[PDB]
Coordinates of C-alpha atoms in Angstrom, one line a residue:
Chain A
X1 CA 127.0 95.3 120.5
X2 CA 127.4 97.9 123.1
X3 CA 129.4 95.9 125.4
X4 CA 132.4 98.6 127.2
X5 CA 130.7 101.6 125.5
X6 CA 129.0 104.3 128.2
X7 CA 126.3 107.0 127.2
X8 CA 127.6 110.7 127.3
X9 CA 125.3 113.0 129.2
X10 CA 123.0 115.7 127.1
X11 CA 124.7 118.3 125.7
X12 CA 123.1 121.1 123.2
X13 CA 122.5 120.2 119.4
X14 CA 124.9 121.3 117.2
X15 CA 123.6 124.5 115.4
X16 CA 124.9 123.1 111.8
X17 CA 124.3 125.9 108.6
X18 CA 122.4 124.7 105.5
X19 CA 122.1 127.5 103.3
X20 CA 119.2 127.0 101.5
X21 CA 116.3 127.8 104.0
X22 CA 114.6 124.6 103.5
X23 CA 117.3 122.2 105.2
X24 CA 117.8 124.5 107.9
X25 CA 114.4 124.9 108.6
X26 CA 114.1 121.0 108.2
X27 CA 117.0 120.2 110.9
X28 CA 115.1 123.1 113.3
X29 CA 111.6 121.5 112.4
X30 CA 113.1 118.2 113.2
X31 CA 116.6 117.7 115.4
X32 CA 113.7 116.8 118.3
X33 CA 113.8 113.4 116.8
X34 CA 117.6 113.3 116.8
X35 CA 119.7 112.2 119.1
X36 CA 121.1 114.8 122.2
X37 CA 123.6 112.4 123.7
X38 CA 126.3 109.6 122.4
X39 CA 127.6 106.5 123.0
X40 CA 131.5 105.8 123.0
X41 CA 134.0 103.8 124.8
X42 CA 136.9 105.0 126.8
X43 CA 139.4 107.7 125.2
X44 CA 142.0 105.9 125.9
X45 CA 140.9 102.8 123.5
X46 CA 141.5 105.3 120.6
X47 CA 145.0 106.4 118.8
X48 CA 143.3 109.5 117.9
X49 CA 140.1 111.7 117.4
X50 CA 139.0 110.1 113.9
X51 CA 139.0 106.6 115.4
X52 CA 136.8 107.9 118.5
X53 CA 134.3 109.8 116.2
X54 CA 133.4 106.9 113.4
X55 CA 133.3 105.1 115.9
X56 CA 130.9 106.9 118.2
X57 CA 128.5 108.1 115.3
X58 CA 128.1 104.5 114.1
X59 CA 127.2 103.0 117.0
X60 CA 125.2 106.7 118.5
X61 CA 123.3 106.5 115.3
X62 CA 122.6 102.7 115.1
X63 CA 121.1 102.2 118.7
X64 CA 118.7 105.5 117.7
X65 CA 117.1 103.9 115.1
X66 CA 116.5 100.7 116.6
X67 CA 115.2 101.3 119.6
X68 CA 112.8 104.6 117.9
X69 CA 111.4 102.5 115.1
X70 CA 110.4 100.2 117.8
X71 CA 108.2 102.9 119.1
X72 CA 107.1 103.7 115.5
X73 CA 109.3 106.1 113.2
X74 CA 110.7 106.8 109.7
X75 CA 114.3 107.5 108.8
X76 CA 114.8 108.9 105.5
X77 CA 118.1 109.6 103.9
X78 CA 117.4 113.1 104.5
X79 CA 117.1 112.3 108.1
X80 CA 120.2 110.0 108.1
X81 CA 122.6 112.4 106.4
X82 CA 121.4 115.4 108.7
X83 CA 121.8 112.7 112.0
X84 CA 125.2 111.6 110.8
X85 CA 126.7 115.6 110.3
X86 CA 125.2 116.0 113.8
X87 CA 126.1 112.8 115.9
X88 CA 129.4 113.7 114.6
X89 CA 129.7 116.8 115.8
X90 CA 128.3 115.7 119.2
X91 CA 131.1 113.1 118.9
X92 CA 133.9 115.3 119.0
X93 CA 132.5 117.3 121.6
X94 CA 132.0 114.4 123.7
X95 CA 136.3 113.4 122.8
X96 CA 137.1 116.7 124.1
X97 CA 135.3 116.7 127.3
X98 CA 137.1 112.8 127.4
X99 CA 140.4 114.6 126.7
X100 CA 139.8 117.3 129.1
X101 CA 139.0 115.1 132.3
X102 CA 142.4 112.8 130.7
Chain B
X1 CA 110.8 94.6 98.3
X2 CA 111.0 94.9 102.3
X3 CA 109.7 91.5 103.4
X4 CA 109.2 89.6 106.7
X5 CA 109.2 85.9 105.9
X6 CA 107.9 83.8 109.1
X7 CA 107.6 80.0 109.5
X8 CA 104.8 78.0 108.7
X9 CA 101.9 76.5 110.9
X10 CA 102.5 75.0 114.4
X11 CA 100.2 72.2 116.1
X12 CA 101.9 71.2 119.5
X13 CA 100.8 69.4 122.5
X14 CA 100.6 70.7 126.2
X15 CA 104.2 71.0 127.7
X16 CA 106.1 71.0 124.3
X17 CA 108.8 73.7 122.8
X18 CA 108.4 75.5 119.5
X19 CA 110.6 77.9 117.8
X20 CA 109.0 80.1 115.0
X21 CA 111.2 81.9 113.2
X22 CA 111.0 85.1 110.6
X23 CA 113.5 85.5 108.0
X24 CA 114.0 89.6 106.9
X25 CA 115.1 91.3 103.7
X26 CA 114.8 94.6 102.0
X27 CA 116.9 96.6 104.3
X28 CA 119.2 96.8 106.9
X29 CA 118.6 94.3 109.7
X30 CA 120.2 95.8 112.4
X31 CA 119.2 99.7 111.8
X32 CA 115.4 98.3 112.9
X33 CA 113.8 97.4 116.1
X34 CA 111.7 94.2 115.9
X35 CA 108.2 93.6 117.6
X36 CA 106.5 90.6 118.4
X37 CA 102.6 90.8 118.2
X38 CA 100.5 88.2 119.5
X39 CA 96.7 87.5 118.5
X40 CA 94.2 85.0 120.2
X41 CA 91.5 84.1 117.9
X42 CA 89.1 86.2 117.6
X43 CA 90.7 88.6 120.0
X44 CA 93.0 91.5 119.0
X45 CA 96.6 92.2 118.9
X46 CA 98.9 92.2 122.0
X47 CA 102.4 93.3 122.4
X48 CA 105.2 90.2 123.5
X49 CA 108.5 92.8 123.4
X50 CA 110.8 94.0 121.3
X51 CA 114.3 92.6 119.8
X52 CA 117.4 95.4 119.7
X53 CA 118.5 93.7 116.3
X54 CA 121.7 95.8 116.9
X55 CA 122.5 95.0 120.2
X56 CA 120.5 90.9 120.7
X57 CA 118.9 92.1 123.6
X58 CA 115.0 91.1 124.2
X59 CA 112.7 92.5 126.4
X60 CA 109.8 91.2 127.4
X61 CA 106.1 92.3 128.2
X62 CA 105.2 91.7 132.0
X63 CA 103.0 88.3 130.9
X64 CA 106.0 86.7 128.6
X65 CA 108.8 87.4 130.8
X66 CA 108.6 83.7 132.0
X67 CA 108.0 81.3 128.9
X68 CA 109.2 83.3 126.0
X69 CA 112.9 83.9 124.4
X70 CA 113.6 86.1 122.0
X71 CA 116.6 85.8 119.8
X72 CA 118.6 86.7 116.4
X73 CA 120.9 85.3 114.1
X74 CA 121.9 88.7 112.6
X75 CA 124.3 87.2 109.8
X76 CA 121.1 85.7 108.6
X77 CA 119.2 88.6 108.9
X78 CA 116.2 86.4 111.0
X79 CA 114.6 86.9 114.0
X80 CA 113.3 83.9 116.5
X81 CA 110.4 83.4 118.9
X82 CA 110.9 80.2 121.7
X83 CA 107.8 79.2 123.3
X84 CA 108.4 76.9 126.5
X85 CA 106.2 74.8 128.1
X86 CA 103.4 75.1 126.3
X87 CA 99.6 75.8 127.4
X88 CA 96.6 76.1 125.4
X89 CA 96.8 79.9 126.2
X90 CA 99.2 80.0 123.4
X91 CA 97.4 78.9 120.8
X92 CA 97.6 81.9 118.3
X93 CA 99.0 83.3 115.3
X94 CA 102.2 85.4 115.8
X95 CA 103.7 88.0 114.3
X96 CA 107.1 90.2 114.2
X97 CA 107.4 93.7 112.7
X98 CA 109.7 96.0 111.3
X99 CA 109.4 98.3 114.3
X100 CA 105.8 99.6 113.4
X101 CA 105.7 99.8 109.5
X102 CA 106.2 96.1 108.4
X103 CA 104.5 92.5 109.6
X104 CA 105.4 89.5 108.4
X105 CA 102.7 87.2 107.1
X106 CA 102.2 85.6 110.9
X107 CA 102.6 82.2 111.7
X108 CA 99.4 80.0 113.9
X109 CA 100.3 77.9 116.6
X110 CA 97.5 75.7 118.1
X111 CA 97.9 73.8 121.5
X112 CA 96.1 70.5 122.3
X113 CA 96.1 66.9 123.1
X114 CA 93.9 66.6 120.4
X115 CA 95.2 64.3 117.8
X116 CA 95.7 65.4 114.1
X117 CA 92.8 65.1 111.4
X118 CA 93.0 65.7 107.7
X119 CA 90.6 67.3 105.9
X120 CA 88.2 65.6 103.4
X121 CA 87.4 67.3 100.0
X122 CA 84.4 66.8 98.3
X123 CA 83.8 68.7 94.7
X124 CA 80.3 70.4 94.3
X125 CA 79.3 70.4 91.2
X126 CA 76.4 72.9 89.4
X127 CA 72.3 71.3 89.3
X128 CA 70.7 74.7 88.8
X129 CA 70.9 78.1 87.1
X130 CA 72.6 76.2 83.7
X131 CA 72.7 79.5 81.8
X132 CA 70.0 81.9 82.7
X133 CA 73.1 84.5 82.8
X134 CA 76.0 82.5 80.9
X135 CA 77.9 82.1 84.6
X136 CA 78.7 79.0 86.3
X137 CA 79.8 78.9 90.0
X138 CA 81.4 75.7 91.0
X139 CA 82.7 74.9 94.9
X140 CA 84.6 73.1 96.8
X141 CA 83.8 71.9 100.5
X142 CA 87.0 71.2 103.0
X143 CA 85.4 69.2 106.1
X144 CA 86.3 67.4 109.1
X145 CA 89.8 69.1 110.1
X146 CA 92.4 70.2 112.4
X147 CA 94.1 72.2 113.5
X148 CA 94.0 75.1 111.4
X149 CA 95.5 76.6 109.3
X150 CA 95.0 75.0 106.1
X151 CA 95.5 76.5 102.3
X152 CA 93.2 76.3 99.3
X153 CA 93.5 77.2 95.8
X154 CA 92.1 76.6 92.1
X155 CA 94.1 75.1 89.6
X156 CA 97.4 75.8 91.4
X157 CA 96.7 79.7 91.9
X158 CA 96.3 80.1 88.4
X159 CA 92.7 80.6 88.7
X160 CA 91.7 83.6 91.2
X161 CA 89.2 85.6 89.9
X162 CA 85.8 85.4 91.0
X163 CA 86.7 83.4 93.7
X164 CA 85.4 83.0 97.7
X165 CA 87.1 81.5 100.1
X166 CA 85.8 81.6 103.2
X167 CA 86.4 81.5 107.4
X168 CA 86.6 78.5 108.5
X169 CA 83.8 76.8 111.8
X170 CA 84.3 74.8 114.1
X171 CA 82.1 72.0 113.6
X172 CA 82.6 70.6 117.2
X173 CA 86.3 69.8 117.5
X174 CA 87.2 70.0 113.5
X175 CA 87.3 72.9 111.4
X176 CA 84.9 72.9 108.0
X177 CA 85.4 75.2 105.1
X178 CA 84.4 76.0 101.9
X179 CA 85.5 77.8 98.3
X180 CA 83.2 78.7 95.4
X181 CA 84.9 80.2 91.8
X182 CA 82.3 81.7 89.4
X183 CA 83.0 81.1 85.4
X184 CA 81.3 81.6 81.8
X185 CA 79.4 78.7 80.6
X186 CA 81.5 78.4 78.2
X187 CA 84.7 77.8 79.6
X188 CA 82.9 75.1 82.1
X189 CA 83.0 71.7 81.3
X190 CA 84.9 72.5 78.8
X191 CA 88.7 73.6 80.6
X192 CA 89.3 71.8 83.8
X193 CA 88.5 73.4 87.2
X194 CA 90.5 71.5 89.9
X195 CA 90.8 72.5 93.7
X196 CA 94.2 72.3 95.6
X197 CA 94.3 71.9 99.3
X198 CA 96.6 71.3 101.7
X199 CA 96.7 70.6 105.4
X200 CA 100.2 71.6 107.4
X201 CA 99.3 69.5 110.5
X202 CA 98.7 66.1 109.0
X203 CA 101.3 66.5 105.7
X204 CA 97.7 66.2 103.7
X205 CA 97.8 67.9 100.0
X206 CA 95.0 66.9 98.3
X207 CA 93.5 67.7 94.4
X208 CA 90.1 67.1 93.3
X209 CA 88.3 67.7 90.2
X210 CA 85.1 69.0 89.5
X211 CA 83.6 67.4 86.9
X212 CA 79.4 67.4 86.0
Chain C
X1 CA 99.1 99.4 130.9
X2 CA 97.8 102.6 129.1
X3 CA 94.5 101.5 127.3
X4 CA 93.6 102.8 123.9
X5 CA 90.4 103.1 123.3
X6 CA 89.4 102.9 119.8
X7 CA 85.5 104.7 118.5
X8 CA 83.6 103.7 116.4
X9 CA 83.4 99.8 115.9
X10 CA 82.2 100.4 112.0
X11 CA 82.0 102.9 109.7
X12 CA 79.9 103.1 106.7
X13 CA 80.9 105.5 104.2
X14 CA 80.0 107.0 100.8
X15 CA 82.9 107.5 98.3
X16 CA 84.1 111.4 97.9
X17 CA 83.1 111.8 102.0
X18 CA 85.4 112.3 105.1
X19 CA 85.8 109.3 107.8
X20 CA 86.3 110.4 111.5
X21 CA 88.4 107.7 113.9
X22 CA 89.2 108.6 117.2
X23 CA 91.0 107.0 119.6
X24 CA 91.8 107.6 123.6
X25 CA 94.5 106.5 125.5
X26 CA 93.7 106.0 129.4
X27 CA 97.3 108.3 129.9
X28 CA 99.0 110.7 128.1
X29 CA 101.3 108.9 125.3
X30 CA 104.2 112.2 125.6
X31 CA 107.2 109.8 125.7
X32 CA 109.8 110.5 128.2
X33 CA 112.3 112.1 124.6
X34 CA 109.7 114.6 124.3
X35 CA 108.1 112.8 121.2
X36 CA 104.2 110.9 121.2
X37 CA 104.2 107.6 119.3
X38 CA 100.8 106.8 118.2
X39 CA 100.9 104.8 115.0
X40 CA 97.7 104.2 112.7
X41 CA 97.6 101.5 110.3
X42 CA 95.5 99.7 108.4
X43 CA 94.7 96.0 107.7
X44 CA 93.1 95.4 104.2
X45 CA 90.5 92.2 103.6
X46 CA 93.6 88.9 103.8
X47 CA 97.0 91.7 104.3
X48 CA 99.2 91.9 107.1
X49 CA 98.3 95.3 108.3
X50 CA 100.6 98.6 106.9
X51 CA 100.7 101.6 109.0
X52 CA 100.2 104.9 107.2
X53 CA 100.9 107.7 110.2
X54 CA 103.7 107.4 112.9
X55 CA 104.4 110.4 115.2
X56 CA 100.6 111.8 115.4
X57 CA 100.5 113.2 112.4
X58 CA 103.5 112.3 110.1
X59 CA 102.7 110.2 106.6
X60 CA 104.9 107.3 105.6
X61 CA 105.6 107.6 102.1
X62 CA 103.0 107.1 99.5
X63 CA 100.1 108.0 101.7
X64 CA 98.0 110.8 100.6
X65 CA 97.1 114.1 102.0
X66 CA 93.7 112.9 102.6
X67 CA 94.7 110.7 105.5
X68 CA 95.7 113.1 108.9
X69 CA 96.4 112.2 112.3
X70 CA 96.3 115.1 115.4
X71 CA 95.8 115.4 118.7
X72 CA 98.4 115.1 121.7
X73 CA 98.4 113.4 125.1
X74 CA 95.0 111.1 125.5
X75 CA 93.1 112.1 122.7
X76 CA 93.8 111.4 119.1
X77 CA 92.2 111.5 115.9
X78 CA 92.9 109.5 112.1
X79 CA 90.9 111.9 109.7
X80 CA 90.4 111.3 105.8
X81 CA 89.0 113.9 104.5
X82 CA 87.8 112.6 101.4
X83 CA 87.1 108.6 101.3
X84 CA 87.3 106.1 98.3
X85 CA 87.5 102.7 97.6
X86 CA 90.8 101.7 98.3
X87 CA 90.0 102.7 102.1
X88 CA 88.2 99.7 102.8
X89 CA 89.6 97.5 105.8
X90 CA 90.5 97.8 109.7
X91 CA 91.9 100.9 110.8
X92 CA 93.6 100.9 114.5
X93 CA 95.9 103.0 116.5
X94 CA 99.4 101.5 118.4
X95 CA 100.7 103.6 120.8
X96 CA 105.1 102.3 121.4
X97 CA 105.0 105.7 124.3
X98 CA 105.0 103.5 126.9
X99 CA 105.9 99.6 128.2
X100 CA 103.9 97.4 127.1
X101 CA 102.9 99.4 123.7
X102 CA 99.3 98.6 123.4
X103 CA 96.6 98.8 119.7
X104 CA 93.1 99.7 119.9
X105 CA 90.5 97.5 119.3
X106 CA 89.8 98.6 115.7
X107 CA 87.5 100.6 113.6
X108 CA 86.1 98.3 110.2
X109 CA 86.0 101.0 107.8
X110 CA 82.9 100.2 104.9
X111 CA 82.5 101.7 101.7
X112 CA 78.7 102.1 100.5
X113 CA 78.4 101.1 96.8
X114 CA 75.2 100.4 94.8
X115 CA 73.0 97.8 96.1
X116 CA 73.4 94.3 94.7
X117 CA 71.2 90.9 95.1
X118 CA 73.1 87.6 96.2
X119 CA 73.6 85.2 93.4
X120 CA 72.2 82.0 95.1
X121 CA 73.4 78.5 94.1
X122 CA 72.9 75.1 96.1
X123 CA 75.1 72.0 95.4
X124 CA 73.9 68.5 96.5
X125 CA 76.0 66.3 98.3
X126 CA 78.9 64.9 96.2
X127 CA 79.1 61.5 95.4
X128 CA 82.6 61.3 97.0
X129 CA 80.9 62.2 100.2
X130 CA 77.8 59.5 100.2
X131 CA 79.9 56.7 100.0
X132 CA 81.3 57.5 103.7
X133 CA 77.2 57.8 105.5
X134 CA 77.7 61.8 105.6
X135 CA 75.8 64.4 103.6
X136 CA 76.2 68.1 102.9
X137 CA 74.1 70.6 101.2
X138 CA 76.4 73.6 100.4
X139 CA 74.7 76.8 99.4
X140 CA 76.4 80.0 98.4
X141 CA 75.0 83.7 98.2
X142 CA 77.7 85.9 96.4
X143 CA 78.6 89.2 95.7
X144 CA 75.6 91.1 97.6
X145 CA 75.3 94.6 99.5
X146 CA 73.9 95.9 102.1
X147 CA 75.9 92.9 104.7
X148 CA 72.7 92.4 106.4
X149 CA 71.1 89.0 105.3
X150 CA 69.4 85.6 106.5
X151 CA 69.7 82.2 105.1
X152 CA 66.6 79.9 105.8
X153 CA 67.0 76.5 105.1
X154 CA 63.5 73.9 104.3
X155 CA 63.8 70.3 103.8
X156 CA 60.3 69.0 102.2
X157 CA 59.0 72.3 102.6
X158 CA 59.8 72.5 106.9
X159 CA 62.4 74.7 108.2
X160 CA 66.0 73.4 109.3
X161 CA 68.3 74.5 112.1
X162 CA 70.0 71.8 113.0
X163 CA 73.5 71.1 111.0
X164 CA 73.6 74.3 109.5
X165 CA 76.8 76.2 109.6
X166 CA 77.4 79.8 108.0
X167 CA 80.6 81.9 107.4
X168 CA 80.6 85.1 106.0
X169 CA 83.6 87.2 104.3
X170 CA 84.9 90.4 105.0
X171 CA 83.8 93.6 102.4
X172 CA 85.8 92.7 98.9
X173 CA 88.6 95.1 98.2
X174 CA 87.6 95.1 94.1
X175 CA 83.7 95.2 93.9
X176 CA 83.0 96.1 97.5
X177 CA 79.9 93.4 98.4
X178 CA 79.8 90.9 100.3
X179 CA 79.6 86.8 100.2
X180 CA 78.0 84.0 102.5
X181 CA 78.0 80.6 102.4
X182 CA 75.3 78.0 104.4
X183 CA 76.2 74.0 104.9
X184 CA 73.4 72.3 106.2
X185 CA 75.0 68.6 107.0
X186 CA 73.0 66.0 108.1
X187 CA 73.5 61.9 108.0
X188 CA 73.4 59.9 105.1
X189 CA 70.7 58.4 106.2
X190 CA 68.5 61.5 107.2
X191 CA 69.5 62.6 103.4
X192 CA 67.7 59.9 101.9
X193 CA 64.6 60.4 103.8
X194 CA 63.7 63.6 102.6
X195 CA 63.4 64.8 98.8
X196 CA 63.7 68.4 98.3
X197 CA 65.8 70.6 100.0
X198 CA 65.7 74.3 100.0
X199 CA 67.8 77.8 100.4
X200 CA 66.6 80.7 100.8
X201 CA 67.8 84.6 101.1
X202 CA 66.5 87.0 102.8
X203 CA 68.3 90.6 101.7
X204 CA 67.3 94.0 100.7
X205 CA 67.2 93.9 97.3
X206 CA 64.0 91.5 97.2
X207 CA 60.3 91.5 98.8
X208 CA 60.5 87.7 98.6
X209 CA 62.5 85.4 99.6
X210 CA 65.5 84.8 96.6
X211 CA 65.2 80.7 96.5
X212 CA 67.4 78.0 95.1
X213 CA 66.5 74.4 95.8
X214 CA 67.0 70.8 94.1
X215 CA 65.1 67.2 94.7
X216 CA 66.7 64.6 95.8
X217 CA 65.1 62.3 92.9
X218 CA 67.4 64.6 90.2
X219 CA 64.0 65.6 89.2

């Protein structure tokens, strides 16, 4: 489950561009109910960055809805899709802070 | 098609184990929290915990962290509810959620000494209004039970329109109930009207005709 | 353990009208993620109950406009603004904010319709049943509105409590009325020493009393 993995502190959502007004109003109107911090397991488990980041958004994004829904909420795919792009982005940021302290 | 499939009813003494399970489908197990509800008769709903279906772990409200396990079997998608030790506090119907959209049908659990009863089911049979509107209402009467639950239908389920089943009373230490199904004249004697019950507890499933 | 307090117990309302539901939690349901979940759902007449709003004021799916939920730490509010129906059942807040998540008590929501007059009918004891020393009178009074009624039961004309058991049935989701059924059971013996045995209703929709009875002769 989440056995060796630790929790990244907080770090700023990921300003990510949609175009088309309406999905970039939607992620503004609604990142609060997105994650702000990851889950991964030590760098040095990982050949590379790739391996790190599926990694980290699976398991970021799978603890999320679990233990959310349980309080009472609604994941749609528009809500997955826009989660995913972000976790990810999280994710990489959270490899390079795990790359910079080596 | 997101369903919650639980168990069926429970009847177990003082001091015994019993593990009700609920059997998911219709989405991804493991991308949902799961509640357990619990409900004393007549009384409302209270939260037992949660299950992280990702992660196995349970938690438990202050008043079940002693007798109460929660566990999975995520290949099978199914969610379980241990109750040890037994007390007569128990006796309720159960439920587990989706998180807070979904409930599965609920499953009743009844706590006692109290030996097993079937029911007895007598056919009641029209000796009034004939046809002073062309509708006949016929009944069924379910005494002398327990514990609850039990299940009724007409004719299989085939027939469930214009029907009334109602709550069942305790009569001192047995439960009593009764079902009426209004038809056309017509279609009364003439097509048979039977009543099908069944009684978990005691393995009882009995049919009974209602003839004039 | 936050307490949500749930107002009213029953509501009563005409189709095309809008249905207040308030409910107060004893502390403020702001999670510590800086989001409030306060759930309402509703339990239809034999369902497993659905919820309709999570997150204050967010619709699952399917659920129309009319239905809103507002309001922010202790005191929220499930609003439709135009009732029908379909709305029928038990409406309740669940707040997951805080551990243990806790529901309210409930709000029965009715819908008025025309009124109707029970359909009475009284069944003797079946034969099945007089063979084992035990008699029952069943009677049933369907499909009435308004809920308020009173069975009376008379053997040889005198009035009779003891035995009797009633159960009533929640609103009906199709035609909206509501159902009753009396048992007055007594001992074989008892049974055959008295001849006719009566039901009566006492609702609304008549000055008298609606009657039903049979003699124990067949006659």
């Amino acid at each position: 489950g989440l056995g060796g993995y630790m929790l990244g502190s907080v770090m700023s959502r990921p300003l990510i561009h949609f175009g088309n007004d309406y999905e970039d109003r939607y992620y503004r109107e609604n990142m609060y109910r997105y994650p702000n911090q990851v889950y991964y397991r030590p760098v040095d488990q990982y050949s590379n960055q790739n391996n790190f980041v599926h990694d980290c958004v699976n398991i970021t994004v799978k603890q999320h809805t679990v233990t959310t829904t349980t309080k009472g909420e609604n994941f749609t795919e528009t809500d997955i899709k826009i989660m995913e792009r972000v976790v990810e982005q999280m994710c990489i940021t959270q490899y390079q802070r795990e790359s910079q302290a080596y | 098609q997101i369903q919650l499939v639980q168990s069926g009813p429970e009847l177990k003494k003082p001091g015994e184990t019993v593990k009700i399970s609920c059997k998911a489908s219709g989405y991804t197990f493991t991308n949902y929290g799961m509640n357990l509800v619990k409900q004393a008769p007549g009384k409302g709903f209270e939260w037992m915990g949660w299950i992280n279906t990702f992660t196995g772990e349970p938690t438990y409200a202050d008043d079940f962290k002693g007798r109460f396990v929660f566990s999975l079997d995520t290949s099978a998608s199914t969610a379980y509810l241990q109750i040890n030790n037994l007390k007569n506090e128990d006796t309720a119907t159960y439920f587990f959620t989706r998180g807070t959209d979904y409930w599965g049908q609920g499953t009743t659990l009844t706590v006692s000494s109290a030996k097993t009863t079937a029911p007895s089911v007598y056919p009641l049979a029209p000796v009034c209004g004939d046809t002073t509107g062309s509708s006949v209402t016929l009944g069924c009467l379910v005494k002398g039970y327990f514990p609850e639950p039990v299940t009724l239908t007409w004719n299989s389920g085939s027939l469930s329109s214009g029907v009334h089943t109602f709550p069942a009373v305790l009569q001192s230490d047995l439960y009593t109930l009764s079902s009426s199904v209004t038809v056309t004249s017509s279609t009364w004697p003439s097509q048979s009207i039977t009543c099908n019950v069944a009684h978990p507890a005691s393995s009882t499933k009995v049919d009974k005709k209602i003839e004039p | 353990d936050v307490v949500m307090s749930q107002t009213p117990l029953t509501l009563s309302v005409t189709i095309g009208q809008p249905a207040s539901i308030s409910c107060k939690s004893s502390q403020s349901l702001l999670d510590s993620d800086g989001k409030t979940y306060l759930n309402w759902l509703l339990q239809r007449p034999g369902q497993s109950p659905k919820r309709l709003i999570y997150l204050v004021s967010r619709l699952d799916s399917g659920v129309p406009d009319r239905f809103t939920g507002s309001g922010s730490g202790t005191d929220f509010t499930l609003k439709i603004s135009r009732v029908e129906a379909e709305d029928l059942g038990i409406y309740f807040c669940w707040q997951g904010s805080h551990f243990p998540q806790t529901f309210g008590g409930g709000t029965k929501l009715e819908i008025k319709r025309a009124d109707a007059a029970p359909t009475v009918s009284i069944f003797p004891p079946s034969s099945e049943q007089l063979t084992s020393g035990g008699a029952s009178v069943v009677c049933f009074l369907n499909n009435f509105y308004p809920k308020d009624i009173n069975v009376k039961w008379k053997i040889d004309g005198s009035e009779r409590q003891n035995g009797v058991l009633n159960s009533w049935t929640d609103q009906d989701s199709k035609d909206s009325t509501y159902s009753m059924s009396s048992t007055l059971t007594l001992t074989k013996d008892e049974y055959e020493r008295h001849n006719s045995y009566t039901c009566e209703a006492t609702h609304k929709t008549s000055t008298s009393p609606i009657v039903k009875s049979f003699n124990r002769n067949e006659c």
